[PDB]
């Protein structure tokens, strides 16, 4: 049986699994006030990808395909292709194409295009409103509010590179985006299918441990907090090793290699999330070279030391 | 520890010189230019070289604070570390880790957050890595934006790369130059602590490149980007730290659906791949194929002529 293990990459060296930005800090807090059901960064300890999770860290929240539009309009509808430019298959047992954003908000980026015949290129500012009734990636259609009305050509490879999020400064500050509100993947009236399950701390006195980044802001006063359940490198690691889980909870220990001492211990649940023994909101101040270390398989009733 | 390579397919991996996915394998002659990239450099036992770091998304990104001349639109960014700590130019590196390693015009977005109230702003920005004021080693990078007053001073500012451009009036695909290193300390300066140049020395062998297409934002730019190692291989070698028992490692690219060995290649200890072929050619691979480490062989090992 292949022994289980977690990567030794520090938090700063790892990528957020819900947006192509690096991880900044570890965070813990109560999660009863909302539903923790992200579709990206979902992977079991034995390597089963869940939800909309794929393996490329840079292709989260990116779209590929061809664009059309009503003549004279700045809104462009993109017919989604695969990441390798192949035909999108809307019949796969997934909530949406792999890497589709799993939160409701306004993502601002750049829409780029290349004309195949002569290699001419163009790029424009573009924003996708994942909460809009027109957002339907599962059906293969996504709309981009751009700053041009005639520059993008039809039947040419077009790509959206995400940059950050925006917010209407005239409304309540930090009211957008909502990182714990899943988009409507096939339209405002349809129902999401094949979703990865929701996640909540079950042991009394335990809270989820989030891997937190700060999304770049492009306009207004956006809520730039983004918490993922697993680093993208851990999703890549478990998918490759596919080591069988000997129990339902893998006990991890955070170690400072400058001293060897254990700073805290946490539960890595088989379904793919982390809990710690703590009550209340708190950012974790870790050494720059700290890392997680698998130590032993325990059960679900194990009692962690009250840290983290 | 025994040596091994990741089992990720080519399309599941990231280019190590730009935050974009890999698209195909490519081989060709490399005697007409100097192959000396600084990103995506890592020995098989996990020693990072040049400006290579571990984050696939922190490649070609910049962080710091911006100032500018009143009325002008080129902003000067005083660089900070990737984690907003102060920049230390005394480190034995050619430039901050993740600095672009090619001469060209990278276009992206400059975003900024005012700390006191959380107000944000973003503008189109282009960095000219061939310009005289491109001195990341000294901690200074110039950005040409589309606003002349909107960026505030003493506030955290980040550049997110998107693609490349070129002057549409000049010859097509003359820019960028992916095999021309920028001057990391300014126009007149000389680079330091560079990763060594790479050339296939075995007779009949050529470099195997992991190729991506950089997005184009204006003009007719040369969008080919070749890296010597996928970023996931860099992350893997750094963690495994498996010692090298020879100077070349024999890898086999295999289709897990049929067991067919599709080609053979050498993974050199310094961190690059060679194949037995003459001429330029793209490699058409099945979507599930991946590299598998076989054994440490000697340097006079002759690969099967393929790929």
């Amino acid at each position, epitope marked *: 049986t292949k022994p289980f293990s977690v990567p030794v990459l520090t938090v700063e060296e790892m990528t957020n699994s819900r947006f192509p930005i690096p991880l900044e800090k*570890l965070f813990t807090g109560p999660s009863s006030a909302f539903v923790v059901q992200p579709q990206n960064g979902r992977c079991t300890t034995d390597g089963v990808l869940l939800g909309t999770t794929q393996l490329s860290p840079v292709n989260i929240c990116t779209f590929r395909g061809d664009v059309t539009h009503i003549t004279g309009s700045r809104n462009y509808t993109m017919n989604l292709a695969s990441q390798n430019w192949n035909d999108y298959d809307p019949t796969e047992e997934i909530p949406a194409p792999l890497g589709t954003p799993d939160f409701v908000g306004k993502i601002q980026g750049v829409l780029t295009q290349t004309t195949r015949t002569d290699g001419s290129t163009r790029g424009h500012k573009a924003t996708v409103y994942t909460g809009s009734a027109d957002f339907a990636p599962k059906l293969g259609r996504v709309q981009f509010e751009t700053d041009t009305d005639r520059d993008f050509e039809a039947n040419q490879n077009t790509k959206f590179t995400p940059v950050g999020v925006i917010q209407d400064g005239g409304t309540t500050h930090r009211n957008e985006p909502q990182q714990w509100v899943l988009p409507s993947y096939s339209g405002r009236n349809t129902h999401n299918v094949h979703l990865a399950p929701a996640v909540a701390p079950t042991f009394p006195g335990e809270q989820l441990l989030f891997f937190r980044s700060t999304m770049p802001g492009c306009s207004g006063y956006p809520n730039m907090d983004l918490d993922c359940l697993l680093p993208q490198e851990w999703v890549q690691y478990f998918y490759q090793e596919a080591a069988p889980a000997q129990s339902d909870v893998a006990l991890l220990r*955070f170690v*400072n290699p*400058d*001293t060897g*001492r254990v*700073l*805290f211990e946490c539960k890595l649940h088989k379904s793919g999330y982390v809990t710690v023994a*703590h009550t209340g909101q*708190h950012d*974790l*101040v*870790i*050494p*720059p070279n700290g890392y997680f270390r698998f130590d032993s398989w325990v059960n679900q009733f194990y009692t962690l030391a009250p*840290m*983290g | 520890k025994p040596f091994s390579v990741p089992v990720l397919t080519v399309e599941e991996m990231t280019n190590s010189r730009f935050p974009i996915p890999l698209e195909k394998l490519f081989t060709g002659p490399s005697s007409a230019f100097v192959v000396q990239p600084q990103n995506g450099r890592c020995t098989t036992d996990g020693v990072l070289l040049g400006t290579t770091q571990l984050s696939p998304v922190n490649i070609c990104t910049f962080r710091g*604070d911006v100032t500018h001349i009143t009325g002008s639109r080129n902003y000067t960014m005083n660089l900070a*570390s990737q984690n*907003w*700590n*102060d920049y*230390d130019p005394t480190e034995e590196i050619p430039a901050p880790l993740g600095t672009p390693d090619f001469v060209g015009k990278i276009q992206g977005v400059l975003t900024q957050t005012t700390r006191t109230d959380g107000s944000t702003r973003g503008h189109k920005a282009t960095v000219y890595t061939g310009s005289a004021d491109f001195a990341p080693k000294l901690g200074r990078v110039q950005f040409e934006t589309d606003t002349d007053r909107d960026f505030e001073a*003493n*506030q955290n500012t980040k550049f997110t790369p998107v693609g490349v451009i070129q002057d549409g009036g000049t010859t097509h695909r003359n820019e960028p130059q992916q095999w021309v290193l920028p001057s990391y300390s300014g126009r007149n300066t000389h680079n330091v602590h560079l990763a060594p140049a790479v050339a296939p020395t075995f007779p009949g062998e050529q470099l195997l490149f992991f190729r991506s297409t950089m997005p184009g934002c204006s003009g007719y730019p040369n969008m080919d980007l070749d890296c010597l190692l996928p970023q996931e291989w860099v992350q893997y070698f750094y963690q495994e730290a498996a010692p090298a028992q020879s100077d070349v490692a024999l890898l086999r690219f295999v289709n897990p659906d049929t067991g067919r060995v599709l080609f053979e290649c050498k993974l050199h200890k310094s961190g690059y791949v060679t194949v037995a072929h003459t001429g330029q050619h793209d490699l058409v691979i099945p979507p599930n194929g991946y590299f598998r480490f076989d054994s440490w062989v000697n340097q006079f090992y002759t690969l099967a002529p393929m790929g």
Partner: nanobody, 116 residues
Framework: QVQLQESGGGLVQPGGSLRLSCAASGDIFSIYLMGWYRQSPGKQRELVAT???????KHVYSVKGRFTISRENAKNAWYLQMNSLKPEDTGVYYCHAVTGVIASSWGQGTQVTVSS
């Protein structure tokens, strides 16, 4: 677990200089982040500078080029060299040290006043 004690504040002319010192005692081997904070009149406590065991430093924009943090290799004391002082730098300065993910120790706080 760790106890801190500041010293070296007081009155100073505008444009003058001061050097603050934080004396650490106890399990100093467990410290991996040392820093300086300040609380100005009518303002919340705010960060001034930090330094890691390896020596990675961070100085906030308002003190960049004027304040300099440094530490002893044994982590029994760290310092803050304050040059080109302005009346805006007036406040109570606290030295800080992180020993755990949610465990840290605060100094008592020394008053720094920049005024003629």
């Amino acid at each position: 677990q760790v106890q801190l004690q500041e010293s070296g504040g007081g009155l100073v002319q505008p444009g003058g200089s001061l050097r603050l010192s934080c004396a650490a005692s106890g399990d100093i081997f467990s410290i991996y982040l040392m820093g300086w904070y300040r609380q100005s009149p009518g303002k919340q406590r705010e960060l001034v500078a930090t330094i890691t065991s390896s020596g990675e430093t961070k100085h906030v924009y308002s003190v960049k080029g004027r304040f300099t943090i440094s530490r002893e290799n044994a982590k029994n004391a760290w310092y803050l060299q304050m040059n080109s002082l302005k009346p805006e730098d007036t406040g109570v300065y606290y030295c800080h040290a992180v020993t755990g993910v949610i465990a840290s120790s605060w100094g008592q706080g020394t008053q720094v006043t920049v005024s003629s």
